[model samples]
Target: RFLKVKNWETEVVLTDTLHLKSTLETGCTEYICMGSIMHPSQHARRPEDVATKDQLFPLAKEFIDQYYSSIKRFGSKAHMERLEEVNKEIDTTSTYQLKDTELIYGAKHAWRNASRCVGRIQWSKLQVFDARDCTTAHGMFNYICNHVKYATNKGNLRSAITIFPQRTDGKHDFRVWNSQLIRYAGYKQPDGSTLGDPANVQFTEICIQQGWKPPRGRFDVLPLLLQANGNDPELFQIPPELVLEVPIRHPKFEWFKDLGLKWYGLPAVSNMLLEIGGLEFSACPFSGWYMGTEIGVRDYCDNSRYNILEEVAKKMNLDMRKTSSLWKDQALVEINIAVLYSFQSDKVTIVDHHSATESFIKHMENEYRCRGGCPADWVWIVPPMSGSITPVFHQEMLNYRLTPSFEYQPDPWNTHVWK
Candidate 1:
């Protein structure tokens, strides 16, 4: 008999002798069997074993070496004896646990090393909250609320990261399914157009299917889905008092207020893995203040998202009949300006593309002087709107994998194990 086991996108097949021999010949290295099986001399280990090792210690030595070098470069007050002691322990045990101070430092370093983030100049000020002991969904919910309140900082917008329990052998993992802590609800209308944030339509549908109550208004904040210790995920609604939302309005256009546009005060990304020294903290959530273009250009203006460019162009009475008129470009610029102006008027922190780019260049220079090299993804470093006009557009960038980095992960709801 042949059996197949699948995990999301990965699958393993078990077969009898004849087909097993054929599979071996075909160079299939992912198969696992319970009974005695012939081992091909050239392929003694399965692909899973290799991949597990790859995830475990692929660059442990390099990472440890760099860690020691960085400690010396920054003139940290840490004793050389303790540093050598940890180095030896890591070399021998192939495992290292960071102390509270080290954890705080590592958290900041991870943000600084994030390739896509343009606002790394404030890396040292990141507030690291250790919620690693939270193994229950309710506990995770509380921690998330705390993170939101602290990061929001009453519209001052302090950058912060909260780390939940890491994945361990023989233990369940914790995860947050929502992309961000605060996102507007998207309801599909009868005519097929979305009423609210179009980007969250699918997620909103999932929330409704999972027993969440849909509010009457279009801009309601969706509840968070938290999973802990292999239990069924639970929904937790954020307290309205804790959430700070900015009512969007234009500086000059009186009609802009009629559109009823609004956004959260902070952008806290929850669906990412924090990998430090080869240890993966799958439930770590990080946040930073927004850059105006991130909201005005991609979130609001993308065709698949809110797609407000044409609406704004019409409002401006721009000639939309011809593409040569650059109606979209003008509309996008006005929207970004309004976003920046609105945030400033509301006393909420926000950065413009020009100032943000200049800050990024300064951050790059600082990193080069301190860390010897800086890693940046060009596409992300350059602002989405007016790319050529920004200083970051002209500079070349290099990106490479670094240890103690935050990485994008597959959404928890999409994984078969979560289901």
Candidate 2:
């Protein structure tokens, strides 16, 4: 008999994977994912000898090679010894553990391997906080709080990442459900208007369903949803004191401050999956300093986002109906100016988008000389507003996928083996 997903057993494709209630039941942690026969007497031949280690061993070996080469320790006693130890562990248990040093190195290299990031010049400076030992939702909360506390640093934001537990058997995985560590809440008004950030409306609804008392304000900070083991996630509102906010205001206009726009200092991405070798850390969240244009141009001006450009143009008494009047561009410059001024004034770390792309050009040449080529997408590397003005606009870049990289993952609310 086949297992039911939501209702009766359904026909599936050849490549569809089966989920069992238990393999050998509860005792064996490593072997808990194995498939069991439908009936004891009517069994077909199954490969009992095969293990997941067969698939991961080669990938793990290659990753170890890269790690050793990064430290210039290829063929050294410690390197060779570790390789042998890893192989032996896999042979015995069908899995191996990454040492603390290996874990830290893998994460830092993931940052460097990201091709879309224009601010990867500071990749090597990432600080890793290992939270794999975290087991409970409350434990996840404390770890998340500490990550924000350290990375936010009261003003001068530091690049930091906190890796939660890895996925095991595709069943129970530790995950933080919020898209970011700090984001404004959005509420769906009865009159069909969006209240706060339109980007977070879906996430905000999930929080409300998870029993959050929605204040429904224009700038309410959303709570954290921490999922542990196979159970439903739990919600924890962040302490108000722990949040560092930067208020956006124009340098020239006093009334611009009346718009009451503010953003948090940190941008810790909470839903991304971290992959190194064949291993996946589904809940590894990371953050660096923001780019001023990310806050101003895209975050505020995009049609799907806050869409604030027309308001700024209206206040400036510019011709909104006339495209040739350059009202949009004028408003963009002023708003971008406000974001830069506010961030700097608050002592928070943010790079100018122009400066970021210029430095990216310098970094690209450095990578070419050292590693033969730099993998970058030209469209992503160039600034959004001034395409031609940026030095990287002329540079043709080839984008290629690399191992040990951060990736967009399926939403935690969307993907699950069994509910």
Candidate 3:
């Protein structure tokens, strides 16, 4: 019985300051990706005794409910507005996907890679204070943005992610919606009060669990055998929880829904066919089916060293606007190999030809010791690593270098725009 995989069954692979900076600067067109080191063939046997269906599901349910309750209770309308503004700034900054831009910055990936917003009260604002602790008042908003740019230069249509909220003010004394305030105060309780790591403190004793835990860094690393076949590793474990068989919560989503059950969508019914025999598959869906399937097939091509570059080239012709104009205007854009892994093999391969801007070419030479614009057969070696196929010049890679000697200083008058 092949279950039909819904769109919501995904995960967040990378979320760090780097991701924040990239989205802030480039408008979330590309992202850094990593895959689980354990291959499916390798993991099939090990642990039936591990987290069972009955045990895992209920536990997951509790966790999910707790997560939503916490967010709704403490979430400030002001904070959501601020995040929406930040997302808007990123949206307007580029012409990558201008059409389908969401007022709230949300993306659809093979997995959920939404951003998170953590709150903190200004030290001076706390009613009761702890003088020695190191926590700051600045709200730490963490979210996983989409790694890919959309066709209209506004947002990505395929990859979807989630953004959670938390508060970390020194005493962790904070509340959402500014209403539900349960007192953990009065007594000189060693941990300070309800505000001190409230999320941990409140949920610690709760015996229920829901929603999977965040992915460990190891969950993003691809297996060694797959890397040997010329595939970028980041694209493998996208939309995070490939293992969980949850129903899709939102099928034809119109806007950002709440994080858990209150947000309506069906659970995922099946898993996509991740591999085809030993060939490692590649399926270019022109119409129906889920976009994640395309990503999954892309993963197969990347892991198998198939001619994904050629496949992407053909697809590019079909959707010429995404590549032909807006991104290829001869500028040095850094191409981060780490983030490039989030892309399908064909997208990875085609960028070398379509988007190798002039500045990007020069920057590659200066940083990666790579010579961009080399002929199609060009092969690069990283000294000790003898046979690695290096990335051609792209903004993601160029950004990794020390500031280029010749920065992209655009002339005011003759500036010609594409898209």
Candidate 4:
């Protein structure tokens, strides 16, 4: 049985503060942690938390065994030799090197092992660009630009990842400071209102302090802050031509484009650690196309985010005061339709939630048939909008840990260790 503890009472014991900002402050409905959108830095593990030398050899052994088994080469002469080779290398150098084939396979398996994503069906099709030789911030910038160009594919998005040099001893780490490869900057105005994307204010300010000129707009694209070889991070602005954006407009409403609302084409996730064979890649950025709801419902319609619901509702002449009208729903559906329509009209790749969910169901079942179980966070797998109406909402899911997967890392600001 769980106790029905109230907020004031719980805070009295926990943080020793009765006063706290409610959900209305940010309007992000996390309701659990005083309206703050808090998540663990790493999903299943902590940042820069490398295992001991004794601990890693076993992990390396387990991963190699799994890797060989994956390729139907388990216990083969080559497999045994490679195993002995890996052990000897680790015993001498504290870590073993992964061959080219092993590196690519590890990345593919990592995506297949991702629990939070709904687009794992195409995990095998990712284009892995190995940039582990990059030794400078300039080299990192060039490789990232290439990855963006290739992944964006001139409006037709393709899934890809750029593997940066791995973290050696948690000190000499290659890191990408941005959460995503492409993101808009946010600025807080003095009138108790935000001018740009609220989610970006922290990093946006980081860019500003790094001598980046503020565009002071709702959709100013943020620059990349790249770190190399235990050095301070450097910022590089992305080329405008490479960034594909779709201006949101409704099919029936001619005035919809007047909102000046737009979305970036590629959804590239940076700031994630890619672990392979007990090795930690502190900056391996990955990219895939967006599903419609990511831009429409979660980014735009959510009260804390862009929150264009009220604005769109007024345009549609919907009564905001009456809950019986379900005006928010109407505005939401229309916005989603506009999002899909805009992407489709621009010939950009985007998946509707219905189709995306069905594909996920197929992928989950495929994983179940092959691996017996798939790790999934139910809260993440279920569509934020149309919760019960979706099939995934009713299906039971098991969340567990898996190897060779993407894990979160601490922000660059928090990382102080250096050579």
Best by lDDT: 4
- lDDT over C-alpha atoms for residue 304 of model 2: 81
**Of the candidates shown, which would achieve the greatest TM-score relative to the real structure?**
4
Q: Give each model's whole-structure lDDT.
A: 0.74, 0.78, 0.20, 0.80
Q: What is the lDDT of residue 30 in candidate 4?
A: 45
lDDT of 1: 0.74
Q: Per-residue lDDT tens digits of candidate 3, residues 1-419?
A: 11121112122121112222121121122463212111211222112223233333332233223333434632466434434443453345311111122201111111111111000001111111111122221211111112112110221122121111211111222111101011111111355532222323222222112222322221121111111111111112223232111121222231211212110011111111111001111110000112221222222123331213333333234433465653321111111121133233223221222232332234323322321211111111111111122222111221211100001211111222212
Candidate 4 weakest ten by summed lDDT: 15-24
Model 2 error, position 210 (Å): 0.6
Model 4, 102: alpha-carbon shift in Å?
A: 1.2
Model 3: lowest-lDDT 10 consecutive positions: 114-123
lDDT score, candidate 4, position 5: 16
| Ten contiguous residues minimizing lDDT sum, candidate 2 | 7-16
2 Cα displacement, candidate 3 (Å) = 41
Model 1 per-residue lDDT tens digits across residues 167-232: 654136678888888988888988987887888888898888889999847788999989887667
Model 2 per-residue lDDT tens digits across residues 301-413: 99988889999999999998879999999999999999999999988898898788879877765665566555565656777888777777766654545667777666877
* Tens digits of lDDT, candidate 4, 166-205: 8777767898999998899989889988877898898999
